[PDB]
Every structure is written in structure tokens, then in C-alpha cells.
Write a protein that binds this ligand. Sequence first.
Ligand SMILES: CCCCCCCC/C=C\CCCCCC(=O)OC[C@@H](O)CO
Ligand SMILES: CCCCCCCC/C=C\CCCCCC(=O)OC[C@@H](O)CO
Ligand SMILES: CCCCCCCC/C=C\CCCCCC(=O)OC[C@@H](O)CO
Ligand SMILES: CCCCCCCC/C=C\CCCCCC(=O)OC[C@H](O)CO
Ligand SMILES: CCCCCCCC/C=C\CCCCCC(=O)OC[C@H](O)CO
Lengths: 98, 90, 116
Amino acid sequence: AWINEAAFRQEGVAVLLCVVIAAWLDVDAVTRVLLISSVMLVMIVELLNSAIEAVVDRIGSEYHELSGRAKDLGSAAVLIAIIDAVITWAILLWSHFG
Amino acid sequence: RQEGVAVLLCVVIAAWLDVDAVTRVLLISSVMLVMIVELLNSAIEAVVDRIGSEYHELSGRAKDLGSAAVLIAIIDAVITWAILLWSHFG
Amino acid sequence: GFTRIIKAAGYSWKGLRAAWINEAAFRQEGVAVLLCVVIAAWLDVDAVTRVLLISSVMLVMIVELLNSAIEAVVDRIGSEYHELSGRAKDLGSAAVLIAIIDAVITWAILLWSHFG
Ligand SMILES: CCCCCCCC/C=C\CCCCCC(=O)OC[C@@H](O)CO
Ligand SMILES: CCCCCCCC/C=C\CCCCCC(=O)OC[C@@H](O)CO
Ligand SMILES: CCCCCCCC/C=C\CCCCCC(=O)OC[C@@H](O)CO
Ligand SMILES: CCCCCCCC/C=C\CCCCCC(=O)OC[C@H](O)CO
Ligand SMILES: CCCCCCCC/C=C\CCCCCC(=O)OC[C@H](O)CO
């Protein structure tokens, strides 16, 4: 039901492409696992974030400081996850094709 | 809890196999990740239920989203074990 | 598309800033994580090992943030004791601890192999 939204689609596709790319690369096994897991974690974390966003919104439209805060914190996690993935790919591919 | 059974076993098997430390860290973390995601999913369910037993579009949305996260974590785990065991026994 | 990023980035900054400003323990964890990343970056190890040392402490930060987000929600609903509120927090806290243990182990194991 949730898959049919422009934000999740654009997100799922990026990750999915990375997994596909990671499956084609001529890298050793552990590197391949690290390339795939890192981007999948992005998707996992984004899903939990959106889940939290849903709960907040479920409570209602009336703004509360802690409502904004839960979403910010959620967003921050997605950001750290993405940075983790960027760092992971950078280090492992530089090592490999550099 | 039978998740810890599945978990301990994965930890046992990973401990038993003659793999290097890096491989062993990945076999274990991939399983630990499923547990972290499940506990966070469960926490989100706890909150959805704390708000009300009554149905709401957004309450089900939250639960579907958390559940999809657990699934992706499980898939990540299966892929990790497949790839590493294939390579270990390659 | 461009704005989704810009918006989310700004929320992310507010989240980090809020977590930092509100708890000493969060700041101290941030210091620990940053020291760990820096050490991992300045260490004579292969790339995969470097990535594991780094991603393991990052995960700690990720689960810390998600869990604090859940706490924010619980606290938002009511200050009153409620079984499901205590439970949400208990579960979330379990998650954070596992992430931390996984990290300590990951570093213990990998640093043993390299140095020992
Ligand atoms: C060689 C190609 C890959 C290079 C390495 C980098 C790949 C891994 C990094 C990112 C993939 C996930 C991106 C998520 C989509 C996104 O931006 O979401 C923004 C908002 O929607 C968040 O709410
Ligand atoms: C002679 C043969 C030796 C090799 C035998 C290989 C056996 C592999 C056994 C287990 C791997 C499991 C990977 C998925 C982890 C997972 O699913 O975590 C549990 C949760 O999903 C529970 O909800
Ligand atoms: C590669 C490392 C990426 C990050 C790794 C994870 C650790 C992140 C640690 C802290 C998050 C940002 C903290 C912001 C600092 C802050 O709030 O100062 C006070 C001012 O706001 C007052 O006006
Ligand atoms: C986000 C969009 C990215 C778009 C990128 C476009 C350019 C293609 C780059 C890499 C693909 C893999 C290419 C290398 C495959 C490779 O290493 O193959 C060796 C062996 O033959 C494998 O068995
Ligand atoms: C129940 C079975 C689940 C099956 C899940 C499929 C996972 C797809 C991942 C990679 C595709 C490429 C194949 C990877 C094989 C492999 O070990 O690659 C590492 C090293 O490159 C080896 O040298």
C-alpha cells in the first residue's frame, strides 16, 4: 500500500540499483556484503523513520514540540545511515578500482 | 522467546565455522541487526496500541512500514549468509 | 526532489542539535563515536576492517536516534505511566544496547586480530 508513493519509489529504486550494481561488481565476498548491507540499511532506517512519522501524524495535526522532535530525530537517523553508506562505498570502491 | 533461539543458533553456528574474524563479525551482526530492527518495530507497535485499539489509516501504515523494515533486515541477513558461506565453501 | 533533500537535511540537523543540547549522555556518546571514527580512519587496517569499525559505531548512533524518536513520541502522548509506554521504551532501549554491544564486540574482535 505504501510502495505506491513517489518518495518511497525514488528511494527504493536508488537502493535497488545499488544492490544490482553490487551484485555485478567483481569484488570479493565481504566487500559485496558490505556494499549491499549498507544501502539496505538506508532503506530499513527510512522505513522506521516513516513509521515513526505515521505514529506522530496519527496523534493529530496539532503541533507539539516533541512531535517535531520525533520526526527530526527520525530524519537524523536516516541521514547517519546515508552517510554510513556513502562512506562504505567510497572506501571499498576506492580500495578496489583505485 | 524463540527469536533468541534462532539468534543463539546463528551465533553458535557462526562461532563453530572455521571462518576469519571479519566473516564472523558479518554473520553475527547481520543477525543482530534483525533483532535490533524487530525490537524497534515492536516498540513502534507498542506506541500504536498505546494510542488506541481502534483502527486508523495511519496506525496500520506505521505497522506496515515497521514490518517492511524487519523483512528487509531479514533479507539482508539471508543475502549476507548466502554470499559468505558460498565464498567460504567456494 | 531537490527540496525533499533540503527539507530532510534541515530536520536532520534539528534532530542532531536537539539530541546534543538536551543530554550530556548523548554528547558523550557523540564524542565516543567521533573518536572511534577518527581512530578507525588513522589505523593500519585493510578497507573492509576499516568499514566495519566505522559502520558499527555509526549503527549505534542510528539506533540511538530512532529510539530517541520513539521516546519523543511516547512522551508526547502522555507523562502518565502506562504499560505500553513503558514497554515501547523498554524495547527501544534493548535495541540501543544491542547496537552498542555489537560495536564493542566488533571492535574487540577486529583489534585483536590486527594487533594480537
Ligand atoms: C556507484 C553508485 C553508488 C555510489 C554510492 C552511494 C550509494 C548509497 C547512498 C545512497 C542510497 C540511498 C539514497 C536514499 C534516497 C534519498 O536520497 O532519500 C532522501 C530522502 O528521501 C530521505 O527521506
Ligand atoms: C555442512 C553445511 C554447513 C553450513 C550450514 C548453513 C546453515 C545456515 C543456517 C542459518 C542461517 C540463517 C540466516 C538468516 C538469519 C535469520 O533469519 O535470522 C533469524 C530471524 O529471521 C528470525 O525471525
Ligand atoms: C562522519 C561522522 C558523521 C557523524 C557521526 C555521528 C556523531 C554525530 C554527533 C553529533 C551530531 C551533531 C551535533 C551538533 C552540535 C551542536 O548541536 O552544537 C550546539 C549548537 O547547536 C548550539 O547552537
Ligand atoms: C546510480 C546509477 C549508476 C549508473 C552507472 C553506469 C556505469 C556502470 C558502472 C558500474 C557497473 C559495473 C561495471 C563493472 C562490472 C565488473 O566489475 O565486471 C567484472 C567481471 O566481469 C564480473 O564478473
Ligand atoms: C536462499 C538463497 C539466497 C540467495 C541470495 C542471492 C544474493 C545475491 C547477491 C549477489 C549476486 C552475485 C553472486 C555473489 C556470489 C558470491 O559469493 O560473490 C562474492 C565474491 O565475489 C565471490 O568471489
